[PDB]
Structure formats: structure tokens, C-alpha cells
Amino acid sequence: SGAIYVGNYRVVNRHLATHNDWANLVWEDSSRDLLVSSTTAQGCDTIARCDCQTGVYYCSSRRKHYPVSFSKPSLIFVEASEYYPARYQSHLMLAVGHSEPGDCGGILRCQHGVVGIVSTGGNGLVGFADVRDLLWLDEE
Numbered sequence: 235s236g237a238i239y240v241g242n243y244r245v246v247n248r249h250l251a252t253h254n255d256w257a258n259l260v261w262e263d264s265s266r267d268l269l270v271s272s273t274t275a276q277g278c279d280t281i282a283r284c285d286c287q288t289g290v291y292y293c294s295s296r297r298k299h300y301p302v303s304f305s306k307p308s309l310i311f312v313e314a315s316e317y318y319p320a321r322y323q324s325h326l327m328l329a330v331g332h333s334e335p336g337d338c339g340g341i342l343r344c345q346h347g348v349v350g351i352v353s354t355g356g357n358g359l360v361g362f363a364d365v366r367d368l369l370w371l372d373e374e
């Protein structure tokens with residue numbers, strides 16, 4: 235589990251959104267595994283606006299932050315899970331690193347701010363849902 239709190243927005247994995255998230259919905263995209271809801275209190279995270287391919291991510295199954303090199307946001311094939319059938323996920327970035335069912339939501343960050351959140355994994359890989367193209371998260 236895990237979320238990004240920027241301004242009056244909460245960014246979570248679509249597959250982990252609560253009833254309260256859906257009842258206060260701003261935007262969602264199944265093909266990116268993203269959902270954004272509105273909040274009463276202001277958040278303290280800042281979103282990166284860059285093309286960094288290195289950063290650090292939080293892994294809850296190891297209680298540790300790991301440095302990683304990661305691919306550019308792309309259309310990648312993802313195996314079936316209890317949450318989605320086997321399909322292509324868009325705006326996804328891969329890196330070599332530990333991931334487990336329960337690690338989705340962990341933040342990926344570079345020198346400029348929050349890059350994205352854990353969304354896929356397995357086989358010694360970890361996948362991140364990119365949020366750097368979502369410019370509207372910086373206002374309203």
C-alpha cells in the first residue's frame with residue numbers, strides 16, 4: 235500500500251482504491267493502474283518534471299529504500315492477476331529490484347521529486363506507474 239499526497243490530491247494504484255476514493259473521484263485510468271481522489275488536508279509531496287532514468291524506491295516487504303536505474307515510460311505486457319486480466323499497461327517503467335504483492339504504492343523519487351509509484355513486479359523486477367506527464371497535479 236501507499237499513496238502520493240500533492241496539494242489537495244491523493245494518487246493511488248486504481249486496484250487498491252477505497253470506497254471513499256471512488257466517492258471523491260477526480261481521475262482514473264485502468265490502462266495506467268492510476269486513480270486520483272480529492273482530500274481536505276494539503277499534502278507535502280512534490281512531483282518531478284524531468285527525464286531521469288535513476289532514482290530511489292520504497293520497498294515495504296524489505297522496510298528499505300533501494301537505488302535503481304529504470305526504463306523510459308512505455309507500453310508493457312503484464313500477466314493476469316486477481317485485479318486485471320493479462321494485458322498491456324501504458325506509461326510503465328521497469329527496473330531490476332525486489333517487489334512483492336503488497337509493495338504497490340511505494341514511491342519512486344529522483345533529485346526533482348516524486349517520479350511514480352510501484353504498480354507491477356515479480357521475477358526480480360519492479361514496475362512503476364509514471365506520473366511526471368500529469369501536469370494538472372500541480373494546481374486546482
Ligand SMILES: NC(=O)c1ccccc1CC(=O)N1CCC[C@H](C(N)=O)C1
Pocket residue numbers: 249267312315316317318323333334335336337338352353354355356357360361
Ligand atoms: N510488485 C507487485 O505488485 C508484484 C510483485 C511480485 C509479483 C507480483 C506482483 C503483483 C503484480 O504484478 N500485479 C498485481 C496487482 C496489479 C498489477 C497491475 N498493475 O496490473 C499486477
Ligand SMILES: [Zn+2]
Pocket residue numbers: 282283284285286344345346347
Ligand atoms: Zn529527475
